[PDB]
Design an enzyme around this catalytic site. Sequence first.
Site, mmCIF file in Angstrom:
data_model
loop_
_atom_site.group_PDB
_atom_site.id
_atom_site.type_symbol
_atom_site.label_atom_id
_atom_site.label_comp_id
_atom_site.label_asym_id
_atom_site.label_seq_id
_atom_site.Cartn_x
_atom_site.Cartn_y
_atom_site.Cartn_z
ATOM 1 N N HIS A 69 0.819 -1.227 0.000
ATOM 2 C CA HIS A 69 0.000 0.000 0.000
ATOM 3 C C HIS A 69 0.859 1.287 0.000
ATOM 4 C CE1 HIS A 69 -2.884 2.955 1.848
ATOM 5 N NE2 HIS A 69 -3.779 2.284 1.139
ATOM 6 N N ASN A 161 -13.403 5.335 2.309
ATOM 7 C CA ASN A 161 -14.065 4.522 1.291
ATOM 8 C C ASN A 161 -15.380 3.876 1.732
ATOM 9 O OD1 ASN A 161 -11.644 4.998 -0.179
ATOM 10 N ND2 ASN A 161 -10.702 3.261 0.857
#
Lengths: 279, 5
Positions: A69, A161
């Site tokens: 990530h 998100n």
Amino acid sequence: AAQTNAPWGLARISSTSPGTSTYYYDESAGQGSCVYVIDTGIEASHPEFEGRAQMVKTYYYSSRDGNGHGTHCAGTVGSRTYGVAKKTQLFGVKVLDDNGSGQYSTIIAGMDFVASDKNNRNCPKGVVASLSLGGGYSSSVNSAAARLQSSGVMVAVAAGNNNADARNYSPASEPSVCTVGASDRYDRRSSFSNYGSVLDIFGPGTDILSTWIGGSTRSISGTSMATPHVAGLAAYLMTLGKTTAASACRYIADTANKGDLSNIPFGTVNLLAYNNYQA
Amino acid sequence: LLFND
Ligand SMILES: [Ca+2]
């Protein structure tokens, strides 16, 4: 300068319309600026970073990115092929473990660390911090982000998100930082992107190609991906002398493409990051 | 779909 056949998000930030494939940018490319990527770490040895990335602090047993990530986000800020600011200096701060998680106390420590550490570095054009992370509301986490911003660092954070109002998430909900939502290649709000009055700007977040661990690349999606687009754009603009750390978020919003996005709920800004490059 | 908040 022009990069042909660029990842769609880079092309998008240098165009007033969707669907183009060339990223146009000034050759200065963020040289002289510094961006701290506060995340799972950065695979500094990846050829795409050209020796411009360095791990400076870890809160775990190793400084290695065992997740990917952080390396992906760093690649979007400043890798040669996948980056917005292709000559910036990247510093990695590992506050997330290899599963991508981390306690709020650690994340706060990492923000306080960057506020101090930047005083030991040569970043004549300015300092940016990119935080592609977050969780439920915390006044302490918000306060840490506010301090980082106050110390003279341009702070960019992911909106989240959850397809929800970012007011309930941190550090997304701290008004003083630059909170970034995500869009897709057809100029729609990304289906997972948070929204709400606290968002400052949108950047490309769906299907973003960037660096990955093991010297690889991959495409992933998230407000985590939009955030480094804005962080890199800030570094780029700072190097050009157009804005400063204190005012970069506002400058980016002022000069954004306006009204181009669809599926933006009433009350959320319709502003898409744009570099305003003219050859 | 998360790569987050
Ligand atoms: Ca803000």
